[PDB]
């Protein structure tokens, strides 16, 4: 019945299998397609995204072959026929594949993905891609969120205990490093990605004692880097006083980077604990605090004047909790047609703002060249070039008096070549090198656009060729369904 | 800087490893321990919760060794010292692992699973075990909330493309097969499972050919169980009038299954949709439906008098939208003292309610002899066994005033055991055995615990020694404080 876990290859809906089979038997499995992926409503209702995902699946797509056990169960439980199992068997990528990059800024209604080649590769990935780069660019985009609002404080990623299931935990904290946590607390994510890992202790040793002073004195004789959590018992009367007796015993052989608080009235307690330390003078000595932090709660924490200087964040970066799926997709933008030509494709739905976009499309992000102030995304089918153009027209594509020319620009492609026919020629950055990257991308971003209230939208247009061309195949389909019915 | 992926052991919290280090050098190391995890908030206000995550924890703990780059990570980043990494080198886990089984009903404040033996050992599973065991049975948990609507139609989890990343597809999906789910769409849950897989055809099939018709055609000519997907133009006059042709086309050499609906007021549509498959003839044509489904839409769907047969559920079952954590938590609650006898442990917070239950106990599952009626569950110390007692009281252990004396009752132990001092002594059950087992356990419940709107609360009451040892221990820590004070 159950068969060896060896491989990704069938991480996939049952939906693009049966597809796939379909256009193999049918001789158009090699049929030219163009997909494209894109979220329609920005998560949290951000400014920006911050876009991860690249390096996950670039792991993939090199590893994408179909082992022993996949075609076997394929055969033996699902029944498919052998001639398509050869097929299956036989198969290597070959597919171009075009992406933002990690740390890259990414918005609504825009490609941030595109795959083309065989129709039938392209629908196997679809699934893969989706589950990866979803889940990767909501944490990032989460974390920069609440980085936003400490500032300069340390942002410490904790939250592995709460995450959904093992993938999350990794990936989820190295999106966090990413989108703005300075550290995270999972140690294999350190050794298997390089983030920095930070933590000192929990209850458990507190209680392995039965009183604070002990365990204290018991983590500084066997480490230099203390941060004692002082809440087991009594936060005011028991921890911080004891803390502070460790620290003046032990004197310059341990650092005494400061005390954790983890429950209680944040704001009050840490203005408390403020005077405690510094009135034994301690006035460097740091107060680090965790406890269903967000954003939200952050911000507050600090209009109130808490006196906080290291933020730990766990179920509610981790799991994006207030919402919990980005919702990407992936469609179908342009297929070779009988004549061999390509013929551009729509999909109707209720909503007229929630028809796709047909065509290939490439997305322009426009600076003006005196300051580099952002002007927005301009997005162009694959001919277009705004980088030959003296002049664009810049459009909202519902409301479309609101507009201008825009002169004296840059425009830089965002989907960058990373796979051709199959065959990588773009080189992974180290996550480092990533890191800076969305901070320098975040930097160049006017602050409108960046901050946490209320942020400006930022434009995504369709240009007049783009736009012109979606109206005019929704008419013809439009026109149609009219003929078909009467 | 970056090391090799083959290996679980340190995904971990650094605060486990810190402190473990801090007991191996003083050492405490082997220090017997007791540590207990359990929820305290129902999920989704449901009135019972189902327990997965077993398979996972035992495929964990049976493979728990240091390897080669785990130790050359921790020497030669974290600078661990060498001493230390020996211990790590030569860990084998030798604890007591005592568990409710999956597909069990279980319920907040009470423990679920009880970890026992040296104190460091059990310090490094707590973080991997709550990160799976958390997920999975809130998964479980919102698929039982979901099929409870939906009574004996079936639901599919189709969730995969919006899951929080790889293994909380997989994980998520086999944990929904538990709770309630009949069939997945992700085809490598199905080979490693055995989980039964579904799924026809996509937009993209409708979109390659232009046309309904054509495409419904191809996937008939290819395939003999059909569902043909009818919203890609117009369900109304194009989709399901192209659906009838084909299927009248065809006759017996397909299974015309029906149709599927993906968008559009679902209660509306799925009327004239049930019309139109009926006045042709197909009176045994299913209508599928998918799209933001969950038991709140789904349940309204179904008062509204929607002609929905199949269920297609993804976004919101696989990643619990609207609550995306249990908030399960691992603490210690006894402890080896230095006279070698056991200290039950106790930790403080601001909420006198939310203090931790201390001791090692077991969890009762009182029914009544005559009629298998749902008394609740009853906590006890470990030394207590209801089964030899004629009689016990049940009281609620904040409103001490509701009780009941409860005679001619079976009492079930829900925490079994698991591994003995590290050795397993649990045979794992097929998949198919652990759903019926839920199923069982879900038809034993009575219903005022088992609707979704406002279920009764289950009881879950502490005995009357585990209820007086926790104010004693509550009352002698309080009073400690105040002598460390004044
Ligand atoms: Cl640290
Ligand atoms: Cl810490
Ligand atoms: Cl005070
Ligand atoms: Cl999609
Ligand atoms: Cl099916
Ligand atoms: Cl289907
Ligand atoms: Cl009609
Ligand atoms: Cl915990």
């Known amino acids: 019945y159950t068969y060896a876990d060896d491989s990704l290859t069938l991480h996939t809906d049952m939906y693009q299998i049966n597809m796939m089979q379909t256009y193999w038997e049918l001789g158009r499995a090699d049929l030219h397609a163009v997909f494209e992926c894109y979220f329609r409503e920005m998560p949290f209702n951000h400014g920006y995204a911050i876009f991860a995902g690249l390096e996950r699946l670039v792991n993939y797509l090199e590893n994408l072959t179909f082992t022993e056990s996949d075609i076997a169960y394929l055969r033996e439980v699902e029944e498919y026929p052998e001639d398509f199992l050869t097929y299956l068997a036989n198969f290597e990528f070959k597919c171009t594949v075009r992406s933002a990059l990690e740390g890259d800024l990414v918005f609504n209604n825009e490609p941030l993905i595109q795959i083309e080649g065989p129709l039938a590769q392209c629908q196997l990935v679809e699934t893969a891609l989706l589950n990866m780069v979803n889940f990767q660019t909501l944490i990032a985009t989460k974390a920069a969120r609440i980085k936003s609002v400490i500032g300069d404080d ?243 594509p519902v409301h479309t008096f609101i507009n201008k020319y825009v002169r004296d620009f840059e425009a830089r492609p965002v989907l960058q070549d990373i796979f051709v026919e199959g065959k990588r020629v773009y080189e992974l950055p180290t996550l480092d090198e990533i890191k800076q990257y969305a901070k320098e991308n975040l930097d160049s971003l006017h602050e409108e656009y960046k901050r946490d209230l209320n942020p400006q939208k930022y434009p995504v247009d369709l240009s007049t060729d783009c736009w012109n061309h979606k109206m005019n195949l929704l008419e013809k389909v439009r026109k149609d369904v009219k003929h078909l019915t009467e």
Not at 291 to 313: F, H, R, Y
Not at 330 to 343: A, N, Y
Request: aromatic letters at 10%.
């Open 154 to 396: 340390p942002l410490l990623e904790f939250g592995t205990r709460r995450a959904q299931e093992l993938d999350a935990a990794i990936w989820g904290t190295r999106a966090a490093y990413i989108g703005g946590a300075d550290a995270t607390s999972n140690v294999r994510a350190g050794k298997i990605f390089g983030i920095p890992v930070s933590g000192t202790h929990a209850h458990s040793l507190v209680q392995s004692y039965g009183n604070d002073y002990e365990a204290f004195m018991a983590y500084a004789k066997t480490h230099r880097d203390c941060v004692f959590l002082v809440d087991t018992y009594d936060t005011l009367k028991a921890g911080v006083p004891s803390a502070i007796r460790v620290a003046r015993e032990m004197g310059d052989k341990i650092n005494f980077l400061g005390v954790r608080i983890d429950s209680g009235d944040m704001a009050y307690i840490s203005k408390r604990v403020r005077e405690q330390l510094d009135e034994a003078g301690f006035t460097e000595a740091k107060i680090y605090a965790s406890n269903d932090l967000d954003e939200n709660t952050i911000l507050n924490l600090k209009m109130q004047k808490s006196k906080i200087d290291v933020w730990g964040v766990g179920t509610k970066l981790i799991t994006a909790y207030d919402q919990p799926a980005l919702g990407a997709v992936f469609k179908l933008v342009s297929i070779e047609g009988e004549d061999g030509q390509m013929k551009d494709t729509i999909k109707l739905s209720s909503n007229a703002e929630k028809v796709t976009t047909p065509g290939k499309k490439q997305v322009w992000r426009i600076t003006r060249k005196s300051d580099k102030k952002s002007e927005g995304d301009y997005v162009t089918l694959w001919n277009e070039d705004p980088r030959q153009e003296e002049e664009i027209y810049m459009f909202h």
